[PDB]
């Protein structure tokens, strides 16, 4: 044919028409723990610790 030949998106390869990528993941920041910040913090050096109490 002579006329009305036109280049469509359907005529090209996936290598001609690639999607753009964003490397940054869409997420919210990780939440910090309640007790690991509110509670008083002590360094243990055995499986158990003991304290005397007035009773």
């Amino acid at each position: 044919a002579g006329f009305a030949n036109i280049q469509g998106r359907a005529d090209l390869s996936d290598v001609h028409l690639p999607d753009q990528v964003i490397k940054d993941v869409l997420q919210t920041a990780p939440e910090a723990s309640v007790l690991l910040n509110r509670a008083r913090k002590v360094r243990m050096s055995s499986k158990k610790t003991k304290q005397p109490v007035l009773a």
């Binding site: 993941v25 869409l26 997420q27 919210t28 939440e31």
Partner: protein, 264 residues
């Protein structure tokens, strides 16, 4: 998703395994454009410089269509996601005005729904005239509510336009539909516009304007004329990540809307 961790049953207890999952989000560019033909006898003898006069109005006319598609969903392209107000309604992040005692408790109901989805409001956009409708409303006691009690008297100047310290941002470009919404609140960082081609102007001294069925309606060479073409390519995304407080995509949304009361 998120991984788990597990308690181990004493020393030499058997540790467990876990995994994690990801998915995709997409954004698509769409095109809006127009042509302005002018016979160049009129360009030459018009005291007004018509090409420098029309350009600001074409920039403004492009911006008006993007707002109307992205906020209200009017003339919206078929590839774009749901618009902010229809999306907020479908998610259930909606409040009918005057279901509480006071517009301030309906705005607070809005802030709580977003906080229960895991997002925070950092601003508004609102109907034209909302500020004067705030100075014009009363408690059941019959006194003004928009300001502290010692600044409620009618002789005094109204405050800077705000709700809960956020500016009202009335939409003065004429895009707004007050039958659909009074106020939209959002985390505005979750709303994204992708610029594929910024507003470009081309001026043509040659070729034709043609009809749908191929007739020539104006020949630029043979009728001593020029035409200005303006083009913009733009994409729109509202980006809800997976929050800890609401995992469900069907009800988590980063914006909420206050809507008009129903009829009798």
């Amino acid at each position: 998703s998120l991984p788990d961790a597990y308690w181990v049953d004493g020393d030499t207890g058997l540790k467990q395994t876990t995994k994690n999952i990801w998915s995709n989000v997409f954004m698509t560019a769409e095109e809006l454009a127009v042509i302005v033909p002018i016979p160049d006898a009129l360009i030459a003898d018009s005291d007004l410089p018509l090409w420098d006069e029309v350009k600001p109005l074409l920039v403004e006319a492009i911006g008006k269509k993007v707002d109307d598609a992205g906020i209200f969903g009017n003339d919206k392209p078929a590839s774009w996601p749901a618009a902010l107000i229809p999306g907020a309604i479908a998610a259930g992040n909606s409040v009918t005005l005057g279901t509480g005692d006071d517009i301030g408790v309906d705005v607070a109901t809005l802030g709580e729904q977003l906080a229960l989805d895991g997002f925070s409001i950092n601003g508004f956009i609102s109907r034209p005239g909302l500020h004067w409708s705030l100075v014009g409303l009363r408690n059941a006691q019959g006194q003004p509510i928009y300001t502290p009690p010692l600044s409620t008297g009618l002789n005094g100047a109204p405050p800077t336009p705000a709700l809960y310290g956020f500016p009202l941002n009335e939409v003065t470009s004429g895009v707004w539909d007050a039958d659909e919404a009074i106020l939209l609140g959002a985390d505005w960082s979750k709303v994204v516009i992708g610029i594929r081609q910024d507003i470009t102007f081309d001026l043509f001294s040659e070729g034709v304007i043609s009809d749908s069925d191929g007739k020539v309606v104006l020949n630029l060479m043979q009728q001593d004329s020029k035409a200005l073409r303006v083009v913009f390519r733009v994409g729109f995304q509202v980006a809800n990540p997976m929050t800890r407080l609401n995992p469900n995509e069907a009800t988590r949304y980063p914006a909420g809307v206050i809507i008009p009361a129903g009829g009798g």
